[PDB]
């Protein structure tokens, strides 16, 4: 191969490379925020469904 | 927390319908008839507020119409009143099937002297309409503020950048 081809695929490995390494440490910083606050997409452990409640009038009143 | 607000005696304070569970029974449906306005905003308003505290005047005018509805008996037809309520007041079920003769010679006398029709079977079981000038309460459970939502997911669904990004894979 000429040094050209090896040194400018060789830079085309880094952009890559260097690319995945950032994206991997975002990735852990987002699971630390996310298990952390639990305002995102992941960890949302289920509550209770409130389409289950009934909103009839009961026998008594007092609820 | 804060401290319960409770009305004063005096706000509690009304002429008590002091009469038996027979004669409550035996007037039952002519008091549902007669009675059927106040006692019906009363538990309009029961339901609507979830609060008795909010409730007293009009539970008042339950317990001024009934004894209207009493007075208006006692005056009127005494003798078949007593005699069929102490015929419902014997049987320990106080069924209405043992009184029926009784019952007739009531409705008779009310039909003569006060022009009461006797509700059928079914009508006093029927949801009616209320017309109160009361407002409607828009916190009867005095819910406070709720938590906002997640944000929702958006936008087109593109690939993942560089694959699985697992290790060494590069797809
Ligand atoms: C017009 C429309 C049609 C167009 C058609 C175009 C194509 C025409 C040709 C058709 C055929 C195409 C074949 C697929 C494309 C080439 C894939 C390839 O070579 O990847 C290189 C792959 C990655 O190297 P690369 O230089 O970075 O990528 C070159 C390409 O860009 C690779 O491209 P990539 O980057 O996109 O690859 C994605 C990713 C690239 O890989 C990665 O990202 C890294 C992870 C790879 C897996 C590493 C696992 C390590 C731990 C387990 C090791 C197991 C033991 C090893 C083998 C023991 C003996 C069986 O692949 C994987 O992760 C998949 C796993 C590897 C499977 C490769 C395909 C195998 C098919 C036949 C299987 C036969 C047995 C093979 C041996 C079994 C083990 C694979 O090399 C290795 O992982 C080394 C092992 C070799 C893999 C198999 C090679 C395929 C040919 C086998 C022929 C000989 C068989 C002999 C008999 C049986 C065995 C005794």
């Not at chain 1, 996310?34 to 997409?41: L, N």
């Not at chain 2, 009469?19 to 006692?39: E, F, I, R, T």
């Not at chain 2, 949801?127 to 406070?144: A, C, F, G, I, M």
Request: proline share 8%; glycine share 4%; aromatic share 8%.
């Amino acid at each position: 191969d000429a040094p050209e081809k090896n040194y400018e695929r060789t830079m085309a490995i880094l952009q890559i490379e260097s690319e995945k390494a950032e994206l991997r440490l975002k990735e852990l910083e987002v699971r630390r925020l996310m298990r952390a606050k639990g305002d995102g997409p992941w960890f949302q452990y289920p509550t209770i469904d409130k389409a289950l409640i009934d909103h009839s009038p009961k026998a008594t009143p007092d609820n | 927390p804060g401290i319960v607000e409770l009305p004063s005696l005096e706000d509690l304070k009304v002429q008590e319908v002091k009469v038996s569970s027979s004669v409550l029974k035996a007037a039952a449906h002519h008091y549902g008839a007669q009675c059927d306005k106040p006692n019906k905003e009363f538990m309009l308003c029961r339901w609507e507020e979830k609060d008795p505290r909010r409730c007293l005047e009009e539970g008042k005018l339950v317990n001024q119409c009934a004894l209207e509805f009493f007075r208006q008996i006692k005056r009127h037809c005494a003798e078949p009143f007593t005699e069929y309520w102490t015929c419902i007041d014997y049987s320990g079920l106080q069924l209405f099937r043992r009184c029926r003769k009784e019952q007739a010679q009531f409705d008779k006398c009310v039909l003569d002297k006060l022009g009461w029709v006797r509700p059928d079977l079914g009508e006093l079981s029927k949801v009616t309409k209320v017309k109160t000038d009361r407002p409607l309460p828009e916190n009867p459970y005095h819910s406070r503020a709720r938590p906002e939502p997640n944000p929702e997911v958006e936008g087109d669904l593109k690939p993942a950048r560089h694959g699985s990004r697992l290790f060494f894979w590069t797809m």
